[PDB]
Each structure stands twice: as structure tokens, then as C-alpha cells.
Design a binder for this molecule. Structure first.
Ligand code: HEM
Ligand code: HEM
Ligand code: HEM
Ligand code: HEM
Ligand code: HEM
Lengths: 238, 238, 238, 238, 238
């Protein structure tokens, strides 16, 4: 049950941590690599009490990245401790740590001021699938966005939501509030079985006025496939 | 036959993947390097059922890049699997993965709203040559482009098309729709025997109004020569 | 006592120095690594006469960074000597020097020209806690900022102060005057037990007019946990 | 004779290729390094039928660069083959490939529409010296430049030419048309015995209106001394 | 005597060359390192006829840099030859060459058009001290700056000079004209015993109108301590 709570409640920290495997990892015998895989698996299980970790194969879809973790935790200290432990494991020691981003899941700022019919649609349940594609786009707003008053921003977000609703059927979403914890304002996360829909979703959004206030849109756009840890690591132990 | 379908149909994913060879690859004896070349060849043939892979020599033409693949696949998960397997082969283990870009081949958005005479010319068959030069330019449009209405954009694309038609005789083209799959909106790909013509084509297009809406033009501009995999890898096995 | 003087007086240089550990550090036997940890410890104690050094675990919270020092000194030459010595120790030789930033603690330029009631609040003592989160944001102002007259800038800083006072309860702060000693105008430093409050503080400040004059805001935003040196280094000696 | 044709005719490709020598090159015994020098020398001679290669010592004058080649070829394929071969030689294998740029020598676009007296001066023969300094500045024009009509651009280039004529006495020049082959529009190349004159030339040019249309000016500005290959490589074989 | 002439006359080239020491330098035994130090010292003395070289400890004050040389020479060829020789010594072979910049010392452009009382002050002798701090800021002016007419620029530089004169007492200065020799227009160099004064000097200058025409200001800002070569290298031979 508590797994659900970290994935849906407000006040939960979400961290996105990317990694790439050193060339010299293959110089290890295959035996060593499988023992190393074992260690990592154990570490994750030991932390399963305090935090939830999900894995993604970025290798072959995202540039300069093999593995990503999405870690949910009630305090970032625990995430620190886990990631430090992880990077210390023998597998971890052969990993070049890529990007790292943090944000807190929060209660919605503009949605209360939307129409009632638009609130119903947002409550509708979309993509419920295993092994979907996963996308992460960090976002930074311009100065102009903050200078706007609440009514203006609420209007712009309503246009945003309107453009995107049709795609809630096949695309799942989650928003993290990132300001002050790194160099972006939000982290956006998505799961979909249909990449061409996701493409059309992003295209629809590029046409709303709100879009021009995204001072940073991507860089990087992370694309991968959701997968259990064992399957990912197994690739490397062969 | 099916080869043609991947290269021409809509809904096919095209991935562009560049690589550079580690200094330490030459520390291997020449025998090891020829065995490794054999591995890679086999892997490509094994995947020949599900995806089409084409190779280009970037070495000596594109900075910080030796090899590029253009991979066509009906699903990006298969491209992932292939590239992951590839990067794992002995040869793959000595390659530093450069850029990686994806886009879907789609049905034309503005071409129906062009004049009939302009539609005839666009259907005309241009460069049919082996071992041609190949160019890849990623493109990102500005906010202002999306804010325009459909009629304005159609107008601007018609100007684009009119500027470029004369060059269809000696330059082949293909457009991939990239938004949401990485940090660019389109990936453009070109084959030509005459680089001087391609130069004059890009020069003609810098003069149309549409051009100023390319927030990102190149970076990198990839230039190479199309070539069978065996020839390219054989260079490295000597 | 004199520890306090360095952390509170004007004319004290604060230097911020980030580091990341080489992959090849783990090729050393665990014995060697414990020896090396000993060395660094000693060097820090030796310099404890002249300068104060504080340590932060960036590992797992800040991208491409494992350790940060905040060094206080009355002359930057001493900081130079200490950092140079540190980088020479065996542990130091396996560290890739990340960013480096300096600024001087100075007497306040605008605060005399604020209201009396606003001066009371600024004097009030906030976060007094061990092992808190620590954030560093380097800042560069635009040309327009400097072109403003004193009255205008004072007005804008009063707005900044007003927005931020409520957060003095749970967030500690320190300002360093960096201009001329590197490529930023200010280094901002913060300690907090409550990241969510820090987030809301930076969000409140993004809405004051002063904010649009930050030509550089972050890049990098350094996030970590304050910790004694032996705990941090101990992680690496295992 | 044919050497002249490549350096003066239109339709000749000029490639600019920079390299830096790996630290571990000195770990080779001095014998090995002289044998390697021999290899490279021979390769250049073997290609002397199809292409012209000239060498420059960038070491000590241009940052992060030791050697530059200026290669002239009637087809870029041949330059590819040569540079690939070169990078493969033992000396080549210890070189980190810096930048790489291409452009075609072309017949002048605006000079026919200049006054007759200004055409006379442009025909006059300037710097005829061995071992001169060499400068390469890549250039990218802004959108605005292309949007101008021919008459406006011709007018601006006439101002450019006028400002720079006095310096034709001591500064030799050549222009390569680079658009579409990489990320710059032009490659500018210069030889001079008098760097202070070159300085004053570039100063004179920063004052003409055309200058503000250079979206990219330099980055890098390459400075070196022209020298035969054997002299340059000899430095490294010691 | 002639030492003065290089440091004061017009037409002398000044080159700024920064270096960082390889990790693997400390794998050498301490004997080898002191022999290496001897080599470099000798080379400098051998070139003492033709050029003047001054050293700065950048380690611990400037990021990614240990050593800087300021070389004065009547011709840049001689600087090239020296720096090449230097990089070739055993010490030199374990150095990663950082930035490199050149400029010529020239007669003042605007000073003749200043008031007489302002000319008197500029003649006054300021900081005469051994082992001072040294700062280098490269500067590139915007297009706008060049488009101004002489009278406008002279006006702006008089404001610049007025702002700065009070600091001539404690800060020594030198200007190198860099355009065409690299990617910047000027190289500014400063010596001071009082960094806090230098800070206030740069702050006073950020408020004059001229300052908004500095398209590039720093990047890097190099900060170090002036010191004899033997002291600096001795640190490394321990
Ligand atoms: C699946 C379809 C989507 C739906 C139904 C949707 C809905 C919403 C809603 C209701 C909010 C307001 C939250 C609040 O009240 O505070 C929001 C915010 C936001 N959305 Fe979406 N969204 C979708 C897709 C996307 C996409 C594709 C992106 C970018 C890739 C994106 C980026 C953002 C960002 C950055 C915010 C924060 C508010 C802001 O823009 O400043 N969303 N979204
Ligand atoms: C070889 C001759 C060329 C022809 C005949 C041609 C024609 C066209 C046509 C007809 C379209 C519209 C298709 C649609 O409606 O979706 C188009 C789109 C596009 N083309 Fe070209 N083109 C040529 C060369 C180029 C070149 C050299 C570039 C850039 C290097 C380029 C970049 C683009 C881009 C980025 C689009 C996306 C539509 C947009 O701008 O929003 N094309 N081109
Ligand atoms: C904890 C609540 C905060 C308070 C009470 C506060 C207050 C102040 C005050 C009173 C000054 C004026 C000092 C003077 O006159 O010299 C100042 C300056 C400054 N503050 Fe804050 N601040 C807070 C948080 C922040 C944050 C979160 C940032 C940025 C991340 C920040 C950035 C700056 C900067 C860069 C200056 C430099 C002076 C200038 O703006 O020109 N402060 N702050
Ligand atoms: C040495 C004295 C110089 C002379 C006599 C000179 C003369 C000319 C002439 C006649 C043209 C027009 C050719 C045509 O019709 O296409 C031209 C173009 C050009 N010049 Fe120069 N030039 C000189 C130096 C320089 C320098 C120092 C630079 C920049 C570092 C430079 C940059 C260019 C560029 C980029 C073009 C391409 C045309 C354009 O601006 O679009 N030239 N020059
Ligand atoms: C120590 C106090 C300073 C004094 C007394 C001073 C004075 C001057 C004077 C008299 C000139 C004109 C010389 C000529 O005719 O070329 C000048 C030019 C110049 N100065 Fe300063 N200066 C000082 C500090 C600085 C500083 C701190 C900087 C920036 C870090 C700076 C940057 C420049 C630059 C780039 C020019 C070139 C003209 C231009 O801006 O286009 N100077 N300075």
C-alpha cells in the first residue's frame, strides 16, 4: 500500500539520477560482474523500507546514459544516503554519474481556478501499462512568467491543460516542483506505450502561449524504457 | 521489398547514432580487431529481420566522429535493443558514443495546401546514386514559429519549397519529426554527389523568411560518405 | 571564539571549492585509502590556526560533485596555500577540481536605508541546527542593475528583503561579495533543515522585480549536507 | 604548376584540421617517435598526386592545439581518405583531433558591382613571404544579413573592401565558402609577417556596418606559424 | 635596464599562458621531479636574452589552473619558440596547457583628448610591491562600441578613467591590444596587495556607461600570486 503513497501524495521528494557505464567495466570477468549485480540488488532491497526506487533502460535511447533511477523519499537525506551507497557498490564504482535532479510533489496551484468540466476530465485514469516508455523533461520558466499576476498565469495554465487533455487517455504524467534544489523549476515525467501520441502532445503544447515562457525546455530530454532492475543489470553481467 | 517500406512509409522511426573510436583500440592486435569486425557484421545481419541499418564514414569529414548509423525501425524499443547489443560487442566497447537523435517519418502537413504545379515538381525523382555524401542537420524552431497560425506557416513553407525545388534534381531529402523524443524538432537528412549544389541549396534557404525561425540550425552539421559497414570497419581492422 | 569571528566579521574571504573523486581511486587498496584519509585530516588540523574549513557531502545531491569545502580566511593567499596543499595529498591527487569561487564578507549597503521595523526582523536568529542541508547559488547581475541609481536599487532590495523575512525562521543565510575575484558578483550560501521552505523562499523571490536583474542565477546550484570531514572521507576509505 | 591551381582556382575544397599531441606520446622512446615521423612524411608524399597539404605550428600560439593542416582537394572524399589515413599512422594515433572545417573556393559575388578603381587595387600583389604567421577566423552571419537585398549587401561589402585595401600590401587573404558543410558560413585565412598590421586590419573592419552582422567571429581564432612538416614533427621526435 | 623596456615600451607583445599539472606527475619519484625543475629553470635563463618571463601561482585561487606565465617579447615567434621548448621539457610534458592569449602594448588612443588635470593623475606612480596578487581579465567589446564615433568613445573612456583614478594608488595596471591575435579585444592585467580595493575598483567601473559594451568580461577571470619560478616549481618537486 505504502508504495502508492510515495507515488501519489504531496510532500514526497522525487529524484532523477542518470548513470553511464565505464568502458573498463567489461575488463572484469563475467563472474565478478554477476556478483556485483547481486550486491546492488541487495542494497535496493535493504532500502525498500524507507524509499522506492524505479529503474529505466536509457541505453540506446538517451545519449550518454545507460541507466536512470527515479527515487521517491520523504526526505532527500535518505535519497542521498541511498545514492551514495549505490555509487559505492562495485557496480557503482564503474558508473559515471550523469545528471541529477530533485523536486517535491505538491498540491495543484491553478487547477482549483479551472472550470468544473475541465476538473472532471483531469480526474480520468489514463495509461495503466507495464514496461512503457518513460520521458523526463526539465523545465525552467522565464522571468516574464513570474512577473505575471495569478489570474494571467491561471489563464495560461488553463490553455495548457485544454490542449493536453485529449492525450491523458494514452499518456501518464507527474510534476515535481524543483526550484531551489537545482537549476530548474520543474521536472516533468511521463509514461506511454505510444511515442507518436507523446510527440503530438508536445506539438499541441508548443502552440499555446504559455510555451514561449519556457526558458529551458529539455537539455536533456531523457527517453527510455521502464524495466525491473534485474533485467537492466543482467544486460551488463553477460 | 520491405527495405523500401521502412525508407518511405509514415510511422517509421529513424534514429541517428554517431560514434568515435577510442585511442586504445589500436593497442589490440590486428587479429583481435578483425574478429571483432566479424562479430559486429553478424549482429547487424541477425537484426536484419526487424530493422534496417545504414552506415556512414564520418571520419575525416565530421569533427569528433568516425562512424554513424541511420537505423529504421517500427518501434524505438527495437532500435534500443540493437544499439545496446552493438555497444556491447568488442568493437562497440571501444567506441565513444557521440550524439543520438530520433524522429518519426510522417505524412506532410503543408504540402496539400500548395499549388498543383508545385505538387508535380515535388513528386519528381532526383539523386539515385551509390556512395554519395550524406548530411544531417538537426533543427529547432523558435517560439514565434509555433505562435503563427496555420495559414502563415503554410505560406512560409511554400516559400521554402519554391526556393529548394531546383535542387531536387541532384539532392535527395528526408524529414523526421523529432519533437518530444529529444531536444530538436526535426532531423533533416540529405544524400548528394554534388556538395557544391548542397551548399547552394542551403544558401538559397537562408534567404527565405522561414529561416529566421530556426532557433537551432546544426550543432552539429554531420557530413560523411555513405558506405557499406564492411568497408568502414575494415579501415579499423588493418 | 575566533571561529565565530571568521564566520561573522566583515573583510573575511570565503572560498567555495568543489571536488569529485576519480574512478581510479577505488583501484587503491582499502589500506592506502585509510592512510590517505589520515593525511588530509592532519593537513586540515595543521591549518586550523590560520583558516576555518567546513565540509559538505555533495555526493548524491549535486551533479558531478562529491565534496565541497567552505574555507574562511583573512587573506586569499592562505586559502591558496591550503587548497594547493590539499590538492597535493594522495587523496587530493585523485580528485578532479570542480568549481572554485571567492567573495569577501562586507558591511550591508542597503539595510541602513530600510524602515526600522524591517531592521528588527533582520536581526532575529533563525536556523540553529547541526547536519543541515546547504545550498550555494552564485549570482551575476545585469548591466541594467548597475545603471540604476542608489534610490532605485535600495527600493528593489527592500522588496527583496520583505519577500524573504518570513523564511528567516527556518533558513540561515550569508552573502559574499565576489565581483573581480571570479565571474560572478555574489555568492549566496544557505543552511536549512527544511528544503521545502527553501523552495518556497526562492519562489517568493522570483516574483519581486529585483529578480529579473539576475543575469546569472545558479549554474551551478550546489546542494548538499553539512557533515564533518571524517564522516565524508570515511565513505571513500571503505 | 598544378600546386598553384589548387591554391587559386574556384571549385577547390579547402579543409582546416587542427590536432593536439597526447601526453602519453612522450612515453614512447625517441627512436619510435622518429620512425613515426618518417611514416607520416611518406603518407603525405604518397597523397601529393591528388591533394596539397600545408602545415602550421599552432603550438605555443593557439590554445589546445599543436598542429594544423590546410588541405586542398578537388573532392572532399580525398581529403577524408587522407585525414583518415593520417589519423591512423602511429603519430596520428597519439593526436587528439581538434576542430575540422571545410569550404569551397568560389568566384566573387559582390566585386563585379564595385567601382573600377577599387577593382584595380584588389588585383595588386601583397605579401610574398616564407614562414609567415597564419590566421584562421571562421565566420557566421546573422539572419538579418541574408534578409538584406543584393544592393544592400553589395554596398556593405564595398565598405568592407574599402576599409581593408590599405592592408593588402602586407596581408595575404583567402576566402572559403563553408555554408552547409559545417556550422559556419565562411572560413577566412591570412598570411602576414606583421601581426601588428593584421591587428589594425581587423580593427578597421570592426568599424564598418557589415561587422555587426557577424553572429560568430572566431571561436576559435587560430594563430600560428607556417612551416614545413618535417620541422614541426621534428620538434616532437626529440 | 632592458627588462624595464619590455615592461613599459609600445610594440612589445605580451602573452598570457596558463597550465595545470597532470595527476600522473606525482607518480614520478621526488628525485626526477627536482631534476625536471632544474631543466625548466635553465631553459628560462637561456631565453633571458630575448624575452622576459614572469610566473604566477594560480593553484588554489584560479579554477583549473596551477601556473601562469606572462611573457614579454618583441616578436611572437620568439614567444612561440620559448613556449614550445617549455612544453617539451619533462615538467612541460606533464602539464595540460590551459588558456593562451596575446596582445601588443600600444600608445594610448583616448588619453590625449582628456583634460590636463586628468592627465597629471594618470602619470602618478601607484603600487610598488613584491609578491602581490595578480589579476587577468580578457575583454571583448560589443558591435555597438565600434559603431560609435571617436568623440563618443573618448567621452566614455574619460568616464572610465575618472571612475578608476582613485584606485591608482593601490592598484597597478597594464593594457594589451589583443584583437586579431585571438578571440578577445583586450587583455587587462593588474597587480595589487589589496584585493578588497580591486573589488571596489571593478564595482566602480560596472556603473559607468562604457561597461555595458563589454560583450565579454572575464571567462576566465584569472587570480593568482606573483612569485619567482623556483618557489612555484619547488612546491611540485616535494
Ligand atoms: C498529459 C497531458 C497533460 C496534462 C493533462 C497536464 C495538466 C497540467 C495541469 C492541470 C497543470 C497545473 C498544475 C497546477 O495546478 O499547479 C500542469 C502544469 C504543468 N505542466 Fe502539464 N499537463 C500535461 C502535459 C504536460 C507536458 C507534455 C509538459 C511538458 C513536456 C507539461 C509541463 C507542465 C509544467 C512545467 C507545469 C507547471 C506549471 C507551469 O507550466 O508553470 N505538461 N499540467
Ligand atoms: C532538397 C530540396 C528540398 C525540398 C524540395 C524541400 C521541401 C520541403 C517541403 C515540401 C516541406 C513540407 C513538408 C510538410 O508539409 O510537412 C519541408 C519541410 C521542412 N524542411 Fe525542406 N526541402 C528541401 C530542403 C531542405 C533543407 C536543405 C532543409 C534544411 C537543412 C530543410 C528543412 C526543412 C524543415 C526543418 C521542415 C519542417 C517544417 C517546418 O519548417 O516546420 N528542407 N521541406
Ligand atoms: C533568508 C531570507 C533572505 C533575506 C532576509 C535576505 C535579505 C537580503 C538583504 C537584507 C539584502 C541586502 C543586504 C545589503 O543591503 O547589503 C540581501 C542581498 C542579496 N540577497 Fe538576499 N535575502 C534572503 C534570501 C536570499 C536568497 C534565497 C537569495 C538568492 C538565492 C538571495 C540573494 C541575494 C543577493 C544576490 C544579494 C546581493 C545584493 C544585491 O542583490 O545587489 N537572498 N538579501
Ligand atoms: C586583407 C584585406 C581584405 C580585403 C582586401 C578583403 C576584401 C574582400 C572582398 C572584395 C570581399 C568580397 C568578395 C566577394 O565578392 O564575394 C570580401 C569578403 C569577405 N571578407 Fe574580406 N577582405 C579583407 C580582409 C578580411 C578580414 C580581416 C576578414 C575577417 C577576419 C574578412 C572577412 C570577410 C568575409 C567573412 C567575406 C565574405 C563576404 C561576406 O562578408 O558575406 N576579410 N573581402
Ligand atoms: C587601475 C585603474 C585604471 C585606470 C587608471 C584606467 C585607465 C584607463 C585609461 C586611461 C584608458 C585609455 C588608454 C588608451 O587610450 O588606450 C583605459 C582603457 C581601457 N581600460 Fe582601463 N583603467 C583602470 C582599470 C581598468 C579596469 C579594472 C579595467 C577592467 C577590468 C579596464 C579596462 C579597460 C579596457 C578594455 C580599455 C580599452 C578601451 C576600451 O574600453 O575600449 N581598465 N583605462
Amino acid at each position: 500500500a505504502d508504495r502508492e503513497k510515495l507515488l501519489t501524495e504531496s510532500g514526497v521528494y522525487g529524484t532523477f539520477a542518470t548513470f553511464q557505464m565505464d568502458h573498463d567495466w567489461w575488463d572484469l570477468p563475467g563472474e565478478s560482474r554477476v556478483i556485483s549485480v547481486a550486491e546492488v540488488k541487495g542494497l535496493v532491497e535493504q532500502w525498500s523500507g524507507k524509499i522506492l526506487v524505479e529503474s529505466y533502460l536509457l541505453r540506446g535511447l538517451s545519449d550518454h546514459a545507460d541507466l536512470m533511477f527515479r527515487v521517491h523519499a520523504r526526505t532527500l537525506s535518505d535519497t542521498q544516503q541511498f545514492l551514495s551507497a549505490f555509487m559505492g557498490t562495485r557496480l557503482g564504482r564503474h558508473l559515471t554519474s550523469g545528471g541529477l535532479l530533485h523536486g517535491v510533489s505538491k498540491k495543484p496551484t491553478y487547477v482549483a481556478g479551472f472550470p468544473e468540466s475541465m476538473k472532471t476530465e483531469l480526474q480520468v485514469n489514463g495509461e495503466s501499462g507495464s514496461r512503457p516508455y518513460a520521458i523526463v523533461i526539465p523545465i525552467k520558466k522565464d522571468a516574464e512568467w513570474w512577473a505575471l499576476d495569478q489570474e494571467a498565469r491561471t489563464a495560461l495554465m488553463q490553455e495548457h491543460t485544454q490542449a493536453a487533455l485529449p492525450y491523458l487517455k494514452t499518456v501518464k504524467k507527474k510534476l515535481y516542483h524543483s526550484t531551489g534544489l537545482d537549476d530548474v523549476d520543474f521536472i516533468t515525467y511521463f509514461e506511454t506505450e505510444r511515442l507518436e501520441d507523446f510527440h503530438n502532445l508536445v506539438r499541441a503544447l508548443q502552440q499555446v502561449k504559455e510555451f514561449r515562457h519556457n526558458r529551458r525546455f529539455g537539455h536533456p530530454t531523457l527517453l527510455g524504457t521502464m524495466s525491473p532492475l534485474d533485467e537492466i543489470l543482467e544486460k551488463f553481467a553477460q
